[PDB]
Design an enzyme around this catalytic site. Structure first.
Site, PDB file in Angstrom:
ATOM      1  N   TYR A 152      -8.915 -30.917  -6.815  1.00  0.00           N
ATOM      2  CA  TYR A 152      -9.872 -29.989  -7.439  1.00  0.00           C
ATOM      3  C   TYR A 152     -10.853 -30.743  -8.333  1.00  0.00           C
ATOM      4  O   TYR A 152     -12.066 -30.588  -8.176  1.00  0.00           O
ATOM      5  CB  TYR A 152      -9.144 -28.900  -8.236  1.00  0.00           C
ATOM      6  CG  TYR A 152     -10.093 -27.788  -8.613  1.00  0.00           C
ATOM      7  CD1 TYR A 152     -10.423 -26.789  -7.699  1.00  0.00           C
ATOM      8  CD2 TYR A 152     -10.698 -27.756  -9.865  1.00  0.00           C
ATOM      9  CE1 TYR A 152     -11.307 -25.771  -8.034  1.00  0.00           C
ATOM     10  CE2 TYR A 152     -11.594 -26.744 -10.207  1.00  0.00           C
ATOM     11  CZ  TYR A 152     -11.895 -25.756  -9.288  1.00  0.00           C
ATOM     12  OH  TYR A 152     -12.774 -24.757  -9.612  1.00  0.00           O
ATOM     13  N   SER A 175     -10.288   5.262 -25.869  1.00  0.00           N
ATOM     14  CA  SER A 175      -9.284   4.991 -26.904  1.00  0.00           C
ATOM     15  C   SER A 175      -8.009   5.745 -26.434  1.00  0.00           C
ATOM     16  O   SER A 175      -8.108   6.935 -26.184  1.00  0.00           O
ATOM     17  CB  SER A 175      -9.774   5.561 -28.238  1.00  0.00           C
ATOM     18  OG  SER A 175      -8.715   5.719 -29.171  1.00  0.00           O
ATOM     19  N   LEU A 176      -6.859   5.099 -26.308  1.00  0.00           N
ATOM     20  CA  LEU A 176      -5.641   5.806 -25.807  1.00  0.00           C
ATOM     21  C   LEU A 176      -4.779   6.298 -26.948  1.00  0.00           C
ATOM     22  O   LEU A 176      -4.589   5.572 -27.917  1.00  0.00           O
ATOM     23  CB  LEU A 176      -4.777   4.883 -24.922  1.00  0.00           C
ATOM     24  CG  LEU A 176      -5.428   4.314 -23.658  1.00  0.00           C
ATOM     25  CD1 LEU A 176      -4.524   3.308 -22.995  1.00  0.00           C
ATOM     26  CD2 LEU A 176      -5.898   5.432 -22.694  1.00  0.00           C
ATOM     27  N   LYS A 208       0.782  -3.139 -20.829  1.00  0.00           N
ATOM     28  CA  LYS A 208      -0.351  -3.207 -21.711  1.00  0.00           C
ATOM     29  C   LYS A 208      -0.408  -4.598 -22.301  1.00  0.00           C
ATOM     30  O   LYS A 208       0.368  -4.940 -23.212  1.00  0.00           O
ATOM     31  CB  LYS A 208      -0.244  -2.126 -22.798  1.00  0.00           C
ATOM     32  CG  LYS A 208      -1.535  -1.954 -23.582  1.00  0.00           C
ATOM     33  CD  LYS A 208      -1.285  -0.971 -24.719  1.00  0.00           C
ATOM     34  CE  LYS A 208      -2.558  -0.637 -25.462  1.00  0.00           C
ATOM     35  NZ  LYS A 208      -2.828  -1.604 -26.551  1.00  0.00           N
ATOM     36  N   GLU A 242      -8.617  -7.000 -19.897  1.00  0.00           N
ATOM     37  CA  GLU A 242      -7.964  -7.597 -21.070  1.00  0.00           C
ATOM     38  C   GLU A 242      -8.013  -9.084 -20.889  1.00  0.00           C
ATOM     39  O   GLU A 242      -7.377  -9.587 -19.971  1.00  0.00           O
ATOM     40  CB  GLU A 242      -6.501  -7.109 -21.220  1.00  0.00           C
ATOM     41  CG  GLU A 242      -6.433  -5.677 -21.710  1.00  0.00           C
ATOM     42  CD  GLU A 242      -6.585  -5.478 -23.208  1.00  0.00           C
ATOM     43  OE1 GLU A 242      -6.199  -6.387 -23.968  1.00  0.00           O
ATOM     44  OE2 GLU A 242      -7.006  -4.379 -23.627  1.00  0.00           O
TER      45      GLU A 242
HETATM   46  N1  LIG Z   1      -6.078  -0.956 -23.174  1.00  0.00           N
HETATM   47  C1  LIG Z   1      -6.292   0.029 -22.248  1.00  0.00           C
HETATM   48  C2  LIG Z   1      -7.159   1.088 -22.531  1.00  0.00           C
HETATM   49  C3  LIG Z   1      -7.384   2.088 -21.601  1.00  0.00           C
HETATM   50  C4  LIG Z   1      -6.731   2.066 -20.379  1.00  0.00           C
HETATM   51  C5  LIG Z   1      -5.845   1.012 -20.071  1.00  0.00           C
HETATM   52  C6  LIG Z   1      -5.075   0.679 -18.991  1.00  0.00           C
HETATM   53  N2  LIG Z   1      -4.407  -0.453 -19.176  1.00  0.00           N
HETATM   54  N3  LIG Z   1      -4.760  -0.869 -20.424  1.00  0.00           N
HETATM   55  C7  LIG Z   1      -5.635   0.000 -21.004  1.00  0.00           C
END
Ligand SMILES: Nc1cccc2cn[nH]c12
Ligand SMILES: Nc1cccc2cn[nH]c12
Ligand SMILES: Nc1cccc2cn[nH]c12
Length: 305
Positions: free
Chosen positions: A32, A78-79, A109, A164
């Site tokens: 590589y 926002s969850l 998560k 993420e």
């Molecule tokens: N951090 C997050 C916010 C909203 C949805 C999801 C789905 N996996 N992580 C999430």
């Protein structure tokens, strides 16, 4: 004049970078590196071969991230939280009272840095920090150094994905070890990843080992997905890095089993997790549930104690 060898180096480096950073390499680091150095030399001596999605983009450039305040095309969710089995049972009961029996998708998560990644005509053109969910900071140049982020999708869509960004545990520990031998230690992989993406110089970001998991899209128009799990499969086919540990389950017993399983298996993972996100799988059913003032009524983040 050099089109065949440049195209050959593009093809080989893209395949090898995918296999290592997305998938088992079929080639050692030395191969590589040797191909990457050769492409870098061709581009230095023959800059007409440079392209926006060249494998050499990954090593970072002179251009700095602006950190300009930029609005997401679509605000980021926002969850609401769950902290025990009861909370999950309440959330399941609220949904089944209203729309009937649903399939859930369960996902890890990641304890990471939320980003929006914007694609125009299939090209990665803008990466923002989540910010306040509406307005973020422009860190495109730095994000481009993350091999798990495709510079060019398999189809030329105009989409904004949500991901993420994170630093693998091993890479985090090895970095703190180098610091220990020579500097002040990062407190955790999340802080180390945040530090890496705040660099003025994308060449500094490139020397840190970062990755991403994509978990959603802003707009499902050009997706044939009828559910969250189908949409993640489609994202895989388009060139994105998603987390393989997701699961479709039939009911709350299934959701609880997945939480209890990952409580016991999370130490084995190569990244930090802080929870498990549970979502109504079906997209039309998510729509039926709608939103509160702040949060979807069709998703919840269970948080480890
Ligand atoms: N951090 C997050 C916010 C909203 C949805 C999801 C789905 N996996 N992580 C999430
Ligand atoms: N995320 C990706 C998609 C397609 C190809 C490659 C090569 N490195 N990363 C890639
Ligand atoms: N969050 C963390 C702090 C210190 C060490 C480790 C290793 N994985 N995660 C860690």
């Amino acid at each position: 004049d050099l089109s065949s060898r440049v195209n050959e180096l593009h093809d080989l480096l893209n395949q090898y970078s995918y296999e290592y950073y997305v998938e088992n390499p079929s080639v050692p680091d030395s191969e590589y590196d040797k191909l990457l150095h050769e492409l870098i030399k061709i581009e230095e001596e023959h800059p007409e071969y440079k392209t926006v999605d060249s494998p050499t983009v990954r090593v970072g450039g002179e251009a700095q991230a602006s950190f300009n305040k930029v609005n997401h095309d679509t605000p980021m969710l926002s969850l609401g939280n769950a902290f025990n089995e009861d909370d999950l049972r309440k959330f399941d009961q609220r949904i089944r009272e209203q729309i009937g029996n649903v399939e859930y998708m369960c996902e890890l998560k990641i304890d990471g840095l939320a980003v929006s990644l914007k694609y125009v005509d299939g090209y990665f053109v803008q990466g923002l920090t989540r910010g306040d969910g509406t307005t973020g900071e422009d860190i495109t140049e730095n994000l481009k150094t993350i091999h798990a982020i495709p510079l060019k999708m398999k189809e030329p869509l105009n989409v904004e994905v949500r991901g993420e960004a994170y630093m693998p545990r091993r890479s985090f520990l090895r970095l703190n070890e180098e610091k220990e031998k020579n500097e002040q230690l990062f407190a955790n992989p999340r802080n180390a990843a945040a530090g890496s993406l705040r660099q003025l110089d994308s060449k500094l970001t490139a020397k840190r080992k970062l990755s991403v998991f994509i978990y959603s899209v802003n707009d499902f128009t050009d997706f044939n997905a009828r559910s969250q799990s189908e949409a993640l499969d489609e994202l895989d086919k388009l060139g994105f890095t998603t987390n393989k540990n997701r699961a479709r389950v039939n009911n709350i017993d299934g959701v609880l089993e997945y939480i209890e399983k990952w409580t016991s298996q999370r130490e084995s993972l190569p990244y930090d997790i802080d929870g498990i996100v549970i979502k109504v799988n079906d997209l039309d059913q998510q729509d039926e549930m709608g939103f509160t003032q702040k949060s979807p009524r069709w998703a919840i983040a269970y948080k480890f104690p």
